Amino acid sequence: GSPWRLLGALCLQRPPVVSKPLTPLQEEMASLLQQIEIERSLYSDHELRALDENQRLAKKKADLHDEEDEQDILLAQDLEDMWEQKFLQFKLGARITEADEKNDRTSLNRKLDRNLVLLVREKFGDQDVWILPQAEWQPGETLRGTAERTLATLSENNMEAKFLGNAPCGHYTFKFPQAMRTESNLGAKVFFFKALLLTGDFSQAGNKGHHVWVTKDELGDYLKPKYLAQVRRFVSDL
Template sequence: MRGSLTSLVRPIVGARGFSTTSEKIVASVLFERLPVVIPKLDPVVYAFQELSGKGDYQIDYVPAPRITEADKTNDRKSLQRAFDRRLYLLLYGNSNGATSGKPAWHFPEKVYDSEETLRKCAESALESVHGDLSHSYFVGNAPMGHMVIQQTENMLEPYKRFFFKSQVIDTSKFNIQKGDDFVWVTKDELLDYFPEQAEFLRR
């Protein structure tokens, strides 16, 4: 799906559940703010509409600016930016995927423990970030995809990471309560935080 992170994770084909073995499982949440405004028209499309008369109309109001103060200052803690793009929440702190054991950037996540379902685990992960789920909407009950993290010299315990998608509903600000820092970033800006996974993210 263009403009989303669906293409960044491997889809689960034919899976109706998840492993119930002792294998470690992590639920991660792609918490996204959908675009607020329609992306600008391509100059070629705009020119065609002008020539065909479809662009000739009267505007009786002054639209709000597309470029906000948060855009000008590159304030990545604000949801009042990149109105024509999707924004994704990243946290800085202890992460299950940090191979060095040091704080790292990651999506909201939680190790599956005793929750009734894996989605409940994902909900718990997001709820621990900003207190409640009243301004979030989980898209579907099943994971949108997963990654298998292999055992390495720095990653002694292999695990599976399942991704759930949730969307911001009816708010422009959250009180982020978890982690040492946080940012809201576009898909392109994710590369700034995961440079070692640049090739994977571009796919």
């Protein structure tokens, strides 16, 4: 054996649920692009229809020669009124949810436009530390297999995850305090593996206050300085 204890950590991420809001400059550029798109476009069918009906009203008022009584029951601008009415009745889903207002950091329904990371709390030598879920490597298993095993040893979940590749995306090696530091147990060598949360969540039984879903910005509050510096390298915030 070796002095270092091999570990496999899981970087399970919930990708954004909704699109990110446009920034002030993006809003102006989006307005100009829409303006340019209209200017360089041909008349649409709905525009040509609204034009003819305007002219028909003139031909049925000035010329007074119209030979068609029926014409069309509904006009173009009248049709737009029905469309706008239907839209106002429909109520969209909230992009800012109850969990956002209540700052419930244990739910997956918060910060829908951001990317969340799963942190669990473990006790190490009678000390409460926040870490990315991990498991100790066992013979006859790959280091990725350890990460997939970690997922299956969480507190009552039905989460389905998609692992991306076999290589680790980061590592963190620490040494135990000299009190327990030994030649055979010098320290540990964590190896993180990124995964995507397809579907699922901790059950109400499993929601008992031993995990959080946090963005990369609010990731330091829980992790330690040195552990944080190594996790903030492969956790993107694009």
